[PDB]
Amino acid sequence: QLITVDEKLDITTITGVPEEHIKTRKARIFVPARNNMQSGVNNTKKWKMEFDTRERWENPLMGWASTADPLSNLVLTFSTKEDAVAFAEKNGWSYDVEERKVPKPKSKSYGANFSWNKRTRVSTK
Amino acid sequence: GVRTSPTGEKVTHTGQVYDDGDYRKVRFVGRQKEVNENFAIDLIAEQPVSQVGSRVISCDGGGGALGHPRVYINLDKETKTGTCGYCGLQFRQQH
Amino acid sequence: PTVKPPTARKFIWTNHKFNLSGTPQQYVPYSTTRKKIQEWVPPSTPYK
Amino acid sequence: SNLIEVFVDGQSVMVEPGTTVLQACEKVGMQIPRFCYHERLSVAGNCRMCLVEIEKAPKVVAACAMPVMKGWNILTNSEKTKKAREGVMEFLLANHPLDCPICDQGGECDLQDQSMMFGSDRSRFLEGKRAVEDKNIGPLVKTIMTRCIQCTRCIRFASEIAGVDDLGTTGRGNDMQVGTYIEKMFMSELSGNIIDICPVGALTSKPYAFTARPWETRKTESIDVMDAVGSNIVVSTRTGEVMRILPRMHEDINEEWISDKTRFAYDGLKRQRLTEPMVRNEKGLLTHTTWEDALSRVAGMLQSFQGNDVAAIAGGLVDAEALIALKDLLNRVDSDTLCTEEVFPTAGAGTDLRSNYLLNTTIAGVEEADVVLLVGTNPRFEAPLFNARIRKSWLHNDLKVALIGSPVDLTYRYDHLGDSPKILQDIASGSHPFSQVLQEAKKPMVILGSSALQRNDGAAILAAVSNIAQKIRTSSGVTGDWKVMNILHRIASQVAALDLGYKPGVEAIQKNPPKMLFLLGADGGCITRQDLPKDCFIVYQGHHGDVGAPIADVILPGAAYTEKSATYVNTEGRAQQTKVAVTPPGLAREDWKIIRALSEIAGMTLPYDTLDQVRNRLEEVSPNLVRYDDVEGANYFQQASELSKLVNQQLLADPLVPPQLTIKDFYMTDSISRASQTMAKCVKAVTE
Amino acid sequence: TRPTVRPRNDVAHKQLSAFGEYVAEILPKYVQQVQVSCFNELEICIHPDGVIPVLTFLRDHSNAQFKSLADLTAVDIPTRQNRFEIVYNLLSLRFNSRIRVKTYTDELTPIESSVPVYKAANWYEREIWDMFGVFFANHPDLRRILTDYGFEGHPFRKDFPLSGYVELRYDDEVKRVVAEPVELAQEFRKFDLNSPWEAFPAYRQPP
Amino acid sequence: TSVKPIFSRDMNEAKRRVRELYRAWYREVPNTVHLFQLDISVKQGRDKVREMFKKNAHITDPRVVDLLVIKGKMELEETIKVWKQRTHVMRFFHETEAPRPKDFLSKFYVGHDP
Amino acid sequence: LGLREIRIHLCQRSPGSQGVRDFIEKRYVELKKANPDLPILIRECSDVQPKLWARYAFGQEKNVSLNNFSADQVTRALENVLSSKA
Ligand code: SF4
Ligand code: SF4
Ligand code: FES
Ligand SMILES: [K+]
Ligand SMILES: [Zn+2]
């Protein structure tokens, strides 16, 4: 037999996270920008959730990068913006959502390179 | 070569040396600062330039498959030598 | 090595060293890179 | 209506005529391999990696260049297609050098990755390889041309985007070489972009050389503050250090390019940094002290001064959060002398109406204009990406461009009317022939540079230019929605300051010299101790020791734009926020926190303890400052023009001469770029 | 039979497909999906209410006889509203065959305990509760099994950090082991490894 | 919003299980101090138990309450059966953690953490 | 304890800001002529409730909702601020 529970989903007290890392963090929900060094677009398909960067310092012995932020490497993947937002809400994280950036559709034409009277005529091939 | 700072601490081949007032040099008191003495930048300069009769020479570091990936070096500029990007050996085109 | 001598190189140690742990010759680790951020040094004259 | 049906592997898709096979595949989420094709460059069709089979056609077609035909079925994964890719990859790699371990492209290389996905897994080439001599094209781009695959992307970008016809191909056949033929430096304000579009390690960043590998970097998507365009960037960091700057695609701002100052000035963030609070000792020399001591000395003075005895100046790289925090702190001692270094005339509407000081047409609107009038500006160096947008419209929409000012080289030919500001009156009065051009245009754009407003007659010039834009809209022909009047800003913090009610320029500080002065990152040298009473208490908050710090009584180390989440408004009025890439060095602190901390020590606590709360305070002063990535329209140009007539001011005889006339003046404009050793190399390169 | 390519086995593929729809015909009340992979593994995806009826049928039916519970585990997929996928791997000795039964649940929905069907499931469900926080109803003895006493959180969830939140050391003042917030001398270095070029067109999702 | 319950049909039934758990913990503190030879008093132990219940007083979902109770009983059983050691029982008191002042100025002096 | 600054927030297209849009269209020019040295910051933003903010000496601020006000009501809300100073 089912029951009715109309309140919002809030699992912050049964996830075991320290309170500091719930209420002081800022999740960013975004689709990663394409790496401009490459033309492939396969890494701009899914939504990502990451957290705000915190202090890294140099280890006195070696000079390694030390951190005290347990969430420094936490990155989650979501199919849609709604999935990511819903996950952030139930875990108690404040968040910013950045709208997906899709490349504009362009009008390409090989013929324009040899225009009779336009500036698109190319001086070299 | 391995120099010493005005404090006496040896300078590594990467140019590292604790400065006058850096507490971290206490780790060497009663012990020593490990410093490799054979500086590779000085050793590779000791090698003589090799004279070749072609515009393009190849290098694999020597030793065949014990060397580095084989690369081809252009020797068209006369103002300088071609340098292997892996092992640092130098080549020049004779006249 | 009396029969098959090793190949000679100008950088190979001529004198072998045994394990030096626990002695003043022991290895002490340290960062081999130089300082990353250069700090502003204030001037040495009162112009203010 | 005119869409035609084509099939990608049997899946129907409706595409406009003129769409290429490659673009048709994109619509079903299939990315055809490519090397020479770039969607923002002219079509080349020379690498042949995009060859794809059309069903029933015996010949594979170049997908990047071939328009689709109705009913065509593109077999993106047929054996005929796969064998074509394997053959081309085999030719591409035949002479390519075995350089991956020493090549900076390694790990983010299109040749590596496409060889993995579309090529064979072995070689059958049993000959010696070609080797090419490298070529020196300046201090920013290193060339290892034996890696070049002759895709000509760099040539097309230099010609079309950068407007520099310096790169080309010499020789022919297998010996064909990309370069400049002669010894020449490719020193354009957009030159660094060719590193990004070169698919291989032939062109790489000299400053970045050998320092990192792609897989180990963390990408912080952020905003550029080197100018007022607000180019979207990726800050690459590793193990707590900033490694390089990359562009981030934003179609309506920077597309996928950044300027060379944006790309290479980050090395100024590792130099001359302010890392500890400083106070003057009993000999009058700055000495390190604690935050507790430093703020207490500031709070004591703040508690003892009121009204016009306290002033502040905001510099060019200041974020909105610090701006509102500083304003609130000074207001609570009844001070209103919150100034910026960058002047904007206050006559008439002043800063009351956003439309008076915005680029109301927006950057993307340049592509819809048919005429552009540039008045007293050098957009090439003031806003390189904005100038790139103009050349894009000049190239593709046959835009007509005219300039009032000095005849600078803008990379595109333009009509030069002159440099006399009096010409503005002639155009308005109808005397000038160009007056007919403005009347006959459906979408005219009049852009006035903020640099011209730094003259002593800025108000007259703004009144003159607004008059021209006013007459254009009264005469009709231009639709009501179109915006004709624009201001091109060059300072990252200017629009946010004006949105918040800062007074533009330091004229107020000159009328009433204050006893206590806050220099919030103010390094323009607009106020010195000659302009202040002998006992002035000067506090400098900032991240660099440049001009403001050495004259200060108290130095408070703040964060740079890479070290804080802070809000900036670009010249369009579009608010954007940076993200923390690394933390501020040493004892430096987030800028708005320093002011909030000071307000508590002085018993004047500001009502916000977190970044979210201070952004709420921003919304209460200008609600658009929290609408991130949104361009908020501003209206009432009529009222602004009405008020700009009330007081007449004289136009001087001085011709309009921009501060930056050649590239050498472009590299060092702010405190970060002035501390950049790379920017110093660029200046040396273009002056020797 | 190309030497580097794994050979297909269509006979096994056919047999497992036929049995897949056999199970779907008999338990339509609970079966939501049946699929057979290209390497011949059969999966039955069911409603969570069917855990006991479905598992009992596969164990006891004369044409099934899946007597052995090889493995019971969970997978966390945060993008799903029911983020936890519960996976039963069963072995039939009589028919020399394997089958996978999958269901789902969220953080707050109990799953019926399968100990009545398989006594082997006892510790597997304790592990799932410990590492994922999925509650199993009517478990004779549900408690942590792998984590430390008093450990907070469920480490195998995708949003639990790799190094956790606390670490241990010996403290001389209190003369005992203590737990303190985690600090790392060298932070774990996240690598971004994925190539931006698609690898497997056969699996491309529609746009 | 029709969901399968865990134990409690609504908050009224859940708060009954909460009170039952609180009694069990309250009675157990005297044994825990004695058995583990802790150097704290029964008053401190029961104040700590009270502090643990209080932090969750704001919950209104019966399912969440049920899971908190389930964990509470698991924690209690670990303590009663001496599966926990003294180090585990004392981790609730964080005796080695230095004070971390929670006012804006104090954080400002020490670092960047909000 | 005088008046230091006025800010007017409104939407460019919502019907709730129509009265504020009319006031700016007809009366802002004359209002600015009477108070040349008074910053009156108009800040439009999409889908915001119109408000009139007034800042007094020492950073005291009060705000008045202008939602659905007519142009005449906007003139009174501003007249009360410019006169009933505090
Ligand atoms: S360009 Fe690419 S394939 Fe060529 S050496 Fe560099 S990383 Fe390797
Ligand atoms: S240098 Fe790079 S971008 Fe230019 S043609 Fe060669 S491979 Fe293409
Ligand atoms: S991408 Fe089409 S031939 Fe190069
Ligand atoms: K490149
Ligand atoms: Zn070599």
Side-chain angles (χ1 to χ4, degrees):
Chain A
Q1 219 42 27
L2 295 194
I3 60 138
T4 286
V5 189
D6 194 87
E7 34 266 53
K8 103 184 284 299
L9 197 55
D10 175 26
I11 59 161
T12 59
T13 62
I14 49 156
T15 55
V17 186
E19 61 143 83
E20 175 203 355
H21 295 119
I22 288 158
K23 296 161 138 21
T24 77
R25 308 312 303 254
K26 175 61 64 156
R28 188 167 82 94
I29 297 165
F30 69 109
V31 181
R34 186 183 47 93
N35 181 19
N36 231 55
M37 297 302 267
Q38 292 189 268
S39 295
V41 298
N42 206 50
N43 285 330
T44 68
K45 302 297 189 199
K46 300 277 143 191
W47 288 82
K48 295 293 170 306
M49 169 177 317
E50 62 172 4
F51 291 83
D52 54 294
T53 293
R54 304 221 155 174
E55 186 184 39
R56 293 165 172 103
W57 66 95
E58 298 169 89
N59 168 245
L61 184 60
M62 299 300 305
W64 295 333
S66 313
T67 202
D69 173 10
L71 304 182
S72 69
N73 295 307
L74 173 47
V75 188
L76 307 163
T77 317
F78 296 93
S79 320
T80 74
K81 184 214 297 195
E82 289 73 36
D83 296 332
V85 166
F87 196 84
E89 301 235 289
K90 73 170 158 183
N91 281 286
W93 295 311
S94 52
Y95 60 88
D96 295 311
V97 185
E98 321 202 351
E99 207 39 58
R100 185 194 275 276
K101 281 195 174 70
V102 196
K104 226 163 45 156
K106 275 108 198 155
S107 315
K108 309 303 296 182
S109 182
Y110 186 70
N113 301 344
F114 327 102
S115 189
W116 157 241
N117 57 1
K118 298 284 174 278
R119 285 163 183 164
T120 57
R121 173 162 267 266
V122 306
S123 39
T124 195
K125 294 222 300 310
Chain B
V2 45
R3 295 171 346 271
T4 36
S5 62
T7 68
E9 188 176 294
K10 297 204 242 73
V11 185
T12 79
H13 80 278
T14 64
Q16 190 273 341
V17 61
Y18 289 135
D19 41 71
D20 202 325
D22 198 315
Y23 86 89
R24 285 170 301 171
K25 73 165 73 70
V26 70
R27 73 188 61 190
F28 301 136
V29 174
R31 307 186 281 201
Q32 52 92 49
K33 181 179 188 189
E34 187 109 343
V35 177
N36 185 270
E37 300 289 41
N38 299 307
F39 283 22
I41 191 175
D42 305 315
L43 294 160
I44 190 56
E46 286 164 35
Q47 293 311 299
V49 175
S50 160
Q51 314 287 136
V52 301
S54 51
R55 294 184 44 187
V56 172
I57 202 74
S58 75
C59 184
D60 65 359
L66 300 179
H68 61 63
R70 188 205 292 130
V71 291
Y72 296 80
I73 295 143
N74 181 272
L75 312 168
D76 280 327
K77 286 221 255 274
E78 294 313 27
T79 63
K80 54 166 208 93
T81 77
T83 310
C84 184
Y86 279 99
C87 70
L89 286 176
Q90 286 173 264
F91 308 81
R92 217 198 318 267
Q93 199 179 3
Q94 54 216 27
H95 59 30
Chain C
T2 49
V3 171
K4 258 298 316 201
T7 296
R9 307 282 185 214
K10 84 191 126 298
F11 48 85
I12 291 167
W13 287 8
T14 58
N15 183 60
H16 182 62
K17 290 181 190 159
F18 45 61
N19 191 342
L20 298 166
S21 184
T23 82
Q25 290 168 83
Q26 65 181 271
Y27 160 73
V28 192
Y30 60 94
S31 180
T32 58
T33 59
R34 309 185 319 272
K35 185 174 71 184
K36 296 286 203 286
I37 309 307
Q38 291 302 145
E39 313 95 299
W40 182 66
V41 163
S44 33
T45 50
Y47 163 51
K48 154 278 331 193
Chain D
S1 207
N2 57 338
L3 305 199
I4 57 156
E5 185 190 34
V6 294
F7 306 87
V8 182
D9 298 299
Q11 225 264 318
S12 148
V13 64
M14 297 288 318
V15 302
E16 304 166 59
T19 274
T20 70
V21 172
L22 180 148
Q23 292 181 297
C25 290
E26 243 165 70
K27 293 265 256 153
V28 293
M30 192 265 153
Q31 190 177 23
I32 297 279
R34 77 290 299 283
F35 284 108
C36 79
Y37 172 80
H38 198 281
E39 78 185 325
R40 303 189 197 275
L41 302 179
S42 83
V43 177
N46 66 56
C47 81
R48 314 310 280 169
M49 202 47 192
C50 69
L51 290 174
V52 69
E53 166 168 52
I54 307 302
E55 200 192 315
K56 297 118 65 150
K59 195 165 205 235
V60 295
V61 308
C64 65
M66 178 57 83
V68 298
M69 290 192 33
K70 188 182 150 294
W72 266 14
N73 190 16
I74 307 148
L75 306 185
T76 73
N77 204 45
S78 175
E79 189 185 277
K80 204 185 179 107
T81 299
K82 294 201 250 69
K83 281 165 83 126
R85 293 161 180 171
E86 270 193 55
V88 171
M89 176 60 42
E90 158 147 80
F91 294 129
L92 278 173
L93 299 179
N95 288 287
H96 196 72
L98 268 84
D99 275 15
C100 296
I102 55 159
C103 165
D104 272 336
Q105 204 70 34
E108 68 195 341
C109 176
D110 270 349
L111 185 58
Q112 278 189 326
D113 284 5
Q114 294 185 84
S115 160
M116 290 308 289
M117 298 318 195
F118 308 109
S120 174
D121 66 347
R122 63 200 58 240
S123 159
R124 63 175 149 178
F125 182 83
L126 315 177
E127 325 300 319
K129 298 179 184 267
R130 157 188 80 212
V132 164
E133 86 169 62
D134 305 328
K135 328 186 155 59
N136 158 68
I137 55 167
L140 293 181
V141 189
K142 154 163 45 152
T143 68
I144 308 285
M145 297 307 301
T146 297
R147 298 165 193 169
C148 172
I149 57 163
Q150 286 83 38
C151 81
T152 74
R153 274 191 189 179
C154 57
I155 293 151
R156 287 174 277 141
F157 176 94
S159 183
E160 296 153 17
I161 308 311
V164 181
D165 290 33
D166 285 352
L167 294 180
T169 36
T170 58
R172 78 190 189 199
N174 193 249
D175 296 59
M176 188 182 75
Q177 278 163 52
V178 170
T180 50
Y181 191 51
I182 59 165
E183 240 293 327
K184 210 189 204 310
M185 311 222 281
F186 183 50
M187 290 318 279
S188 151
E189 72 292 345
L190 298 171
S191 85
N193 289 289
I194 67 181
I195 291 152
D196 281 12
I197 53 146
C198 179
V200 288
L203 304 170
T204 52
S205 166
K206 254 181 202 170
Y208 185 61
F210 310 152
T211 52
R213 278 286 192 206
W215 58 81
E216 80 188 335
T217 73
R218 299 161 187 275
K219 292 71 160 184
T220 292
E221 293 172 343
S222 185
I223 303 296
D224 175 60
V225 301
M226 287 294 100
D227 58 7
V229 166
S231 317
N232 292 30
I233 57 163
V234 178
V235 177
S236 290
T237 85
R238 181 210 59 202
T239 54
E241 166 175 9
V242 176
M243 311 313 294
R244 64 168 176 194
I245 304 299
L246 291 178
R248 188 155 56 102
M249 189 201 79
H250 197 317
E251 297 283 22
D252 294 341
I253 301 173
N254 59 292
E255 301 208 4
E256 75 183 79
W257 324 117
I258 58 187
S259 93
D260 276 5
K261 191 195 286 152
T262 298
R263 192 177 279 279
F264 293 118
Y266 69 94
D267 68 331
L269 301 165
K270 299 149 188 71
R271 292 200 56 246
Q272 309 292 2
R273 296 302 305 274
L274 304 172
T275 53
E276 274 139 286
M278 313 199 115
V279 294
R280 296 279 181 188
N281 66 358
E282 192 58 19
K283 323 302 154 253
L285 303 157
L286 293 154
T287 163
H288 304 290
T289 196
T290 65
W291 270 117
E292 286 79 344
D293 186 71
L295 289 176
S296 276
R297 281 140 153 285
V298 175
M301 307 302 285
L302 193 57
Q303 285 173 304
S304 88
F305 295 121
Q306 259 193 340
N308 286 8
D309 286 63
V310 196
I313 304 165
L317 313 168
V318 177
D319 53 293
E321 283 90 352
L323 285 175
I324 195 52
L326 188 51
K327 195 194 166 187
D328 287 351
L329 185 61
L330 253 70
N331 289 350
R332 270 145 191 71
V333 310
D334 196 37
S335 186
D336 289 288
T337 318
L338 283 305
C339 298
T340 72
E341 314 221 86
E342 187 82 334
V343 187
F344 182 87
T346 40
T351 52
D352 297 347
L353 302 171
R354 282 192 89 213
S355 76
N356 214 25
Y357 57 85
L358 286 185
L359 198 92
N360 299 280
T361 302
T362 81
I363 295 152
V366 170
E367 286 168 312
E368 336 185 23
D370 47 27
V371 188
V372 163
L373 180 57
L374 308 167
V375 185
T377 178
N378 192 353
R380 181 169 193 227
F381 302 138
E382 291 163 22
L385 260 298
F386 179 68
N387 194 61
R389 186 74 69 147
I390 291 163
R391 199 198 143 70
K392 189 183 178 183
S393 319
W394 180 91
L395 191 66
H396 291 298
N397 305 331
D398 207 79
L399 168 78
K400 181 174 265 74
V401 185
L403 161 71
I404 295 152
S406 299
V408 289
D409 182 358
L410 287 177
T411 74
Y412 45 81
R413 181 164 277 98
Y414 60 89
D415 201 357
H416 178 221
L417 315 186
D419 49 338
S420 188
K422 199 191 143 262
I423 296 162
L424 286 160
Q425 322 204 269
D426 306 351
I427 284 154
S429 89
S431 172
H432 210 272
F434 192 83
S435 192
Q436 257 51 235
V437 169
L438 282 169
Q439 231 68 21
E440 291 169 29
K442 223 67 55 49
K443 291 185 170 202
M445 217 181 169
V446 178
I447 302 153
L448 171 56
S450 157
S451 34
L453 296 174
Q454 309 314 298
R455 293 149 53 88
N456 284 302
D457 55 14
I461 287 157
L462 175 54
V465 176
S466 184
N467 193 33
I468 296 157
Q470 166 62 203
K471 282 186 227 288
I472 280 172
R473 305 238 294 194
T474 70
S475 168
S476 209
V478 177
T479 160
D481 205 309
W482 181 254
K483 301 292 185 47
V484 177
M485 185 63 189
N486 297 263
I487 302 293
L488 180 63
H489 291 293
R490 72 220 181 116
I491 298 304
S493 77
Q494 180 67 348
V495 178
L498 308 181
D499 275 347
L500 294 166
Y502 273 60
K503 292 177 168 175
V506 300
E507 40 283 11
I509 282 169
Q510 281 161 321
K511 311 292 151 256
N512 309 311
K515 310 283 181 259
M516 170 174 210
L517 182 67
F518 285 85
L519 296 182
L520 188 54
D523 292 287
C526 304
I527 299 286
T528 59
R529 277 181 182 282
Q530 279 39 60
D531 301 44
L532 306 162
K534 199 79 164 141
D535 45 11
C536 202
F537 190 77
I538 291 174
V539 173
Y540 182 84
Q541 185 176 313
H543 45 71
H544 263 82
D546 198 9
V547 180
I551 68 134
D553 301 285
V554 179
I555 291 162
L556 311 170
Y561 74 99
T562 49
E563 295 141 18
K564 55 182 176 208
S565 189
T567 297
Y568 293 86
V569 183
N570 75 344
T571 186
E572 314 178 302
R574 187 205 300 265
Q576 320 186 95
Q577 59 182 295
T578 69
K579 300 281 143 175
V580 171
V582 303
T583 44
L587 300 178
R589 295 278 181 272
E590 185 167 27
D591 286 80
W592 77 260
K593 285 189 182 171
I594 297 168
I595 293 138
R596 163 64 172 78
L598 176 64
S599 73
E600 187 178 336
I601 302 299
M604 264 153 27
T605 306
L606 303 168
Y608 31 83
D609 295 351
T610 79
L611 179 56
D612 253 345
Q613 291 166 16
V614 61
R615 276 168 192 190
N616 293 329
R617 174 57 180 154
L618 281 177
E619 185 183 42
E620 307 190 322
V621 177
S622 210
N624 60 273
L625 296 169
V626 296
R627 305 303 189 79
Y628 295 104
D629 202 59
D630 297 342
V631 178
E632 219 64 70
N635 237 311
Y636 309 107
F637 171 88
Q638 171 63 36
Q639 286 59 50
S641 50
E642 283 181 76
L643 281 156
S644 80
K645 317 233 185 68
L646 307 211
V647 180
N648 234 48
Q649 297 113 343
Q650 276 271 107
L651 287 154
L652 276 35
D654 304 319
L656 284 155
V657 175
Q660 302 155 293
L661 292 148
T662 66
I663 184 75
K664 80 195 165 56
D665 302 320
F666 166 67
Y667 288 113
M668 314 198 120
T669 67
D670 67 89
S671 65
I672 299 170
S673 48
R674 265 196 308 270
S676 172
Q677 296 180 297
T678 300
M679 295 289 102
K681 274 188 194 68
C682 296
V683 168
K684 196 164 105 78
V686 303
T687 36
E688 291 183 352
Chain E
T1 85
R2 291 144 306 151
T4 70
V5 175
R6 178 203 183 75
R8 283 303 188 282
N9 181 13
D10 201 327
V11 185
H13 193 91
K14 211 198 316 303
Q15 291 169 348
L16 292 169
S17 298
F19 186 72
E21 74 206 18
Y22 179 81
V23 164
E25 285 158 19
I26 289 165
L27 316 159
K29 185 174 168 202
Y30 304 117
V31 165
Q32 298 173 343
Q33 197 160 119
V34 181
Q35 61 188 20
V36 181
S37 69
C38 64
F39 42 89
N40 292 342
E41 305 197 6
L42 168 71
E43 309 188 331
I44 314 305
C45 308
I46 65 165
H47 194 270
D49 281 339
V51 165
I52 304 292
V54 172
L55 288 180
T56 314
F57 167 87
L58 291 167
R59 188 200 66 193
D60 278 344
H61 186 60
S62 287
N63 255 11
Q65 293 188 55
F66 287 93
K67 303 306 203 209
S68 163
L69 171 68
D71 178 46
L72 166 54
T73 201
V75 191
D76 183 26
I77 303 95
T79 206
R80 294 173 181 170
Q81 60 178 104
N82 306 292
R83 65 193 278 187
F84 303 120
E85 185 172 294
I86 318 303
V87 185
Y88 307 74
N89 280 291
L90 323 166
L91 169 66
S92 172
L93 278 74
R94 177 62 57 219
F95 303 111
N96 197 8
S97 286
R98 293 179 186 273
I99 197 164
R100 187 156 37 256
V101 180
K102 301 199 298 178
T103 186
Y104 50 91
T105 191
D106 81 300
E107 301 92 330
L108 294 177
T109 301
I111 278 270
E112 197 60 34
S113 172
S114 77
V115 167
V117 189
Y118 299 105
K119 299 261 170 271
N122 186 320
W123 278 21
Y124 286 117
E125 289 171 16
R126 289 179 57 196
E127 183 167 334
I128 289 167
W129 158 255
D130 196 1
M131 309 324 287
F132 293 98
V134 175
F135 184 74
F136 286 94
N138 302 304
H139 196 285
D141 173 47
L142 201 62
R143 51 185 170 98
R144 79 180 75 258
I145 177 158
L146 292 176
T147 50
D148 182 26
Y149 303 108
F151 185 90
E152 287 167 46
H154 302 295
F156 282 12
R157 287 174 178 192
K158 287 280 159 167
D159 57 333
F160 194 87
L162 177 60
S163 300
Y165 295 103
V166 302
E167 62 179 0
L168 301 195
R169 65 176 182 87
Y170 178 76
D171 195 282
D172 182 73
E173 184 192 286
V174 296
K175 301 284 197 275
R176 58 163 190 274
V177 176
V178 295
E180 310 183 300
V182 63
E183 306 197 345
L184 295 170
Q186 177 170 50
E187 176 199 27
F188 178 86
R189 286 164 278 162
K190 168 163 66 64
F191 287 173
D192 282 346
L193 293 177
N194 294 330
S195 167
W197 283 100
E198 175 187 80
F200 308 117
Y203 298 80
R204 175 158 62 240
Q205 280 143 221
Chain F
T1 66
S2 188
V3 290
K4 179 185 181 189
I6 302 186
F7 282 137
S8 291
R9 306 286 302 181
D10 67 81
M11 278 300 316
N12 216 62
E13 280 164 29
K15 287 139 79 97
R16 193 209 308 320
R17 292 196 155 76
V18 170
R19 278 187 304 267
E20 257 140 29
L21 180 60
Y22 183 78
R23 285 197 210 197
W25 268 110
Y26 184 94
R27 305 291 214 188
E28 193 47 29
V29 168
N31 309 349
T32 308
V33 168
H34 185 80
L35 292 180
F36 285 91
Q37 296 180 24
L38 309 173
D39 296 319
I40 61 144
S41 52
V42 168
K43 197 159 91 43
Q44 306 174 60
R46 286 164 167 177
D47 280 38
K48 177 56 63 179
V49 162
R50 180 73 157 287
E51 197 215 55
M52 278 331 128
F53 280 73
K54 205 98 72 145
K55 59 154 66 184
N56 289 315
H58 67 273
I59 301 305
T60 59
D61 183 341
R63 289 176 300 163
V64 173
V65 177
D66 279 351
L67 272 160
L68 285 165
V69 171
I70 280 158
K71 291 163 186 237
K73 298 159 100 133
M74 282 171 193
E75 202 83 313
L76 179 57
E77 170 157 291
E78 260 164 39
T79 306
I80 276 160
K81 295 192 173 159
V82 201
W83 297 344
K84 274 185 210 287
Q85 301 304 285
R86 177 154 58 208
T87 180
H88 298 104
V89 176
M90 289 310 297
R91 275 166 211 193
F92 292 102
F93 302 83
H94 317 254
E95 294 196 323
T96 57
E97 292 206 27
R100 207 112 190 99
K102 211 100 194 58
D103 66 301
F104 182 88
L105 262 175
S106 304
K107 304 159 163 149
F108 174 81
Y109 292 146
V110 287
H112 320 279
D113 267 24
Chain G
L1 39 61
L3 171 66
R4 290 295 180 271
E5 162 183 280
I6 288 162
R7 320 192 291 271
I8 292 148
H9 303 345
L10 69 156
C11 168
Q12 308 95 334
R13 284 146 183 117
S14 277
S17 312
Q18 185 47 245
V20 193
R21 286 196 286 274
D22 296 336
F23 173 85
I24 296 159
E25 252 181 303
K26 326 246 195 101
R27 291 181 234 228
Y28 164 74
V29 169
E30 34 182 272
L31 179 79
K32 182 66 172 187
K33 270 147 101 166
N35 309 258
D37 283 16
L38 191 77
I40 307 139
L41 313 180
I42 297 127
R43 299 292 180 265
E44 315 144 271
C45 193
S46 70
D47 308 322
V48 292
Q49 309 292 294
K51 303 181 88 73
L52 164 56
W53 292 84
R55 185 161 57 74
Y56 297 94
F58 295 98
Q60 321 287 3
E61 295 190 329
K62 54 205 39 192
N63 60 341
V64 187
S65 195
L66 300 172
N67 202 358
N68 299 323
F69 277 28
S70 92
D72 258 19
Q73 287 154 253
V74 172
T75 303
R76 257 116 66 198
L78 258 161
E79 253 146 20
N80 308 348
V81 163
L82 289 148
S83 339
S84 191
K85 305 215 299 194

